Amino acid sequence: EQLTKCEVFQKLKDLKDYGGVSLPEWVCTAFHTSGYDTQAIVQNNDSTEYGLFQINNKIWCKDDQNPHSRNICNISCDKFLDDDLTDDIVCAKKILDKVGINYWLAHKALCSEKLDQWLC
Amino acid sequence: EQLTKCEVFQKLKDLKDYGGVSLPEWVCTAFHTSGYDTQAIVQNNDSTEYGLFQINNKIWCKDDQNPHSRNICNISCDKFLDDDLTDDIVCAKKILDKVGINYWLAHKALCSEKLDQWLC
Ligand SMILES: [Ca+2]
Ligand SMILES: [Ca+2]
């Protein structure tokens, strides 16, 4: 389901200020990551990334493509392709605590200027 | 509107192989740039970027915010905010001639793996 900025804003409420990352910075990260598409799947030679947060199957969730995943989020990757963001959010917090915002942003400044434009 | 993978595939047909860039490579580029949204507008402290190709008002188009724009594409940035992609494409060709795919991609590798995933 392709979500709108405002719908995403509502749905990511429980991530607000988590780790010190504001809600507007979360919606921005989501835009640049999957364009608000809960079912986005992107493949690489090596891995595959799932849903809105583009969670990979080599470290975070378990795939048929890769059963030998470290599976930190202890979940099957396809749980990140539905409309329920609950489990996506739980996994997104570990990624933040383990690797930081750069998992998603190549440069942080990408989501630090004019943050009020992400406000719904 | 927020177009789907297949809608964008048909709409950018005009660009197939231009500068050597295959069609699946353009769809990949659009995904990563605007998430397929023709009305995306993103602001920086320095400039604003419009539409599908996130064309900036500092060098390519002109708007109320910055009149000192070099305006290489000789056009108003708001023409890059509707559902007709004809003029966006003509301007995207100029950017490709001048700066290359690196206007959109930090690393071309980003859009060279599993190109068949971007096929409709
Ligand atoms: Ca889910
Ligand atoms: Ca247009």
Torsion of CA B17, B21, B27, B31, to 10 degrees: -160
Q: What is the distance in A from the centroid of ligand 2 to the CA of B106?
A: 25
Structure tokens at B67: 């009149």
Distance from CA of A114 to the nearest CA of B (A): 6
Helix or strand (DSSP H, E) at B33? helix B23-34
Burial of A114 (0-12, 13-18, 19+ CB in 10 A): middle
Strand-strand pairing, B41-43 and A48-50? unpaired
| Chain pair A-B, CB pairs under 8 angstroms | 35
The span from the CA of B104 to the CA of A70, in Å, is 33
The encoded tokens of residue A33 equal: 């990551």
The rounded distance, in Å, linking the Cα atoms of B62 and B77 is 6
Per the structure, the count of domains in chain A is 1
8 A C-beta contact, residue B90 and residue B60: no
CA distance A73 to chain B (A): 25
Strands (E), chain B: 41-43, 48-50, 55-56
Q: What is the CATH number of the domain that holds B76?
A: 1.10.530.10
Identify whether the C-beta of residue B65 lies closer than 8 Å to the C-beta of residue B57.
yes
Domain of A76 in residue numbering reads as 1-120
Give the C-alpha separation, A72 to A55, whole Å. Answer: 11
Selected for mutation to probe chain B from A27, A113, A118 (highest B CB count within 10 Å) is A113
| Burial class of residue A12 in the structure, from the number of CB atoms within 10 Å of its CB (0-12 exposed, 13-18 middle, 19+ buried) | buried
Q: What is the dihedral of CA B11, B14, B17, B19, to 10 degrees?
A: -110
d(CA B23, CA B28): 9
